């Protein structure tokens, strides 16, 4: 069973924005994604310290960079705190609602698309770059999810039943035709090493093959 949610009117506005803005530095939607990934690990991390036991699902605190020029995707993966169903649908929502306001005012002020992170928006920098993003997570005491869209103004919910995670979340960026860039090995590296250096957490850079 799918569900179909439409999104809130500010962040359906900020996506527009987002897909139809000409700004070339596209780039930077890795580092917002990987920081994503940084304060989902934080947290789990965080809350071990009172339950160790939120670790039963893994242990191990990281990020993978899996790019697959056959699928066209680059995957974000990470062992973070992952997300509930209320997570996916309501709460980063309603969060991501005010910090779309203040981006959107700071835009009109003059700041550029690449300043989205100071506004905790920067996951839907990923449209710089993908035509769709589909987004599997598992939080503990919570099934595995697989939230997608293509914008448009709607997105979808499904309990997945792909390969189990153990706990954390993956964001399946679908690349646009002219942004395949993002899938080679040097390209990866280089934005990384610029906008990443100091992530508190393995970055492991999968190699194609
Ligand atoms: C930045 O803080 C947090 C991030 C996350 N996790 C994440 C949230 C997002 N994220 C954020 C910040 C806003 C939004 C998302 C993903 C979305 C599909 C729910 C859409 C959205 O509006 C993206 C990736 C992760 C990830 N890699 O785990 C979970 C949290 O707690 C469950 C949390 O603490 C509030």
Known sequence: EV?????????????????????????????????????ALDKIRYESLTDPSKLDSGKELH???????????????????????????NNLGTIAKSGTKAFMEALQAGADISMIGQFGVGFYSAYLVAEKVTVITKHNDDEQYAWESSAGGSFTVRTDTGEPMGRGTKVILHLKEDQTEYLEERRIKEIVKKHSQFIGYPITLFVEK
């Open 3 to 39: 569900e179909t949610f439409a999104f809130q009117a500010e962040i359906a506005q900020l996506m527009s924005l987002i897909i139809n803005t000409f700004y070339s530095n596209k780039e930077i939607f890795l580092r917002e994604l990987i920081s994503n990934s940084s304060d």
């Open 63 to 89: 990020i993978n960079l899996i790019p697959n020029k056959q699928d066209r995707t680059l995957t974000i993966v990470d062992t973070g705190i992952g997300m509930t169903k209320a997570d996916l649908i």
